[PDB]
Amino acid sequence: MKSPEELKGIFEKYADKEGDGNQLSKEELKLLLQTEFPSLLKGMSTLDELFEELDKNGDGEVSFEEFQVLVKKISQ
């Protein structure tokens, strides 16, 4: 969605590796940049503050409602 089928993709590929492909988790956010740009998860203390930067109780999941702050991280 943020690019030619590059953002909505994570949301069906890794978001799908776990349950539906319309929700994410910590084991499928990292794989995102890794495929597109692994070092996109900077901001220091990353690998975790990317989860709270979107939701605060997803329960370890990130639906496309919280995966939006990342949608502006692919296009470029």
Q: Does the annotation list 49 as a binding residue?
A: no
* Residue 54 structural domain: 1-76
Experimental method: NMR
How many structural domains compose the chain? 1
Give every CB contact of residue 10 below 8 A, 6+ residues apart in sequence. Answer: 24, 28, 31, 32, 35, 36, 67, 70
Q: Does the annotation list 68 as a binding residue?
A: no
Q: Does the annotation list 28 as a binding residue?
A: yes
Q: Does the annotation list 20 as a binding residue?
A: no
Q: What letters, b where the CB count within 10 A reaches 16 and e where it falls short, cover 20-52?
A: ebebbbeebbbbbbeebeeebbeeeebeeebbe
- Of the candidates 20, 33, 1, 7, the one whose C-alpha atom is nearest the C-alpha of residue 61 is 20
Cross-strand pairs, 25: 61
CATH number of the domain bearing residue 55: 1.10.238.10
Angle (CA) 8-10-14 rounded to 5° is: 140
Q: Does the annotation list 23 as a binding residue?
A: yes
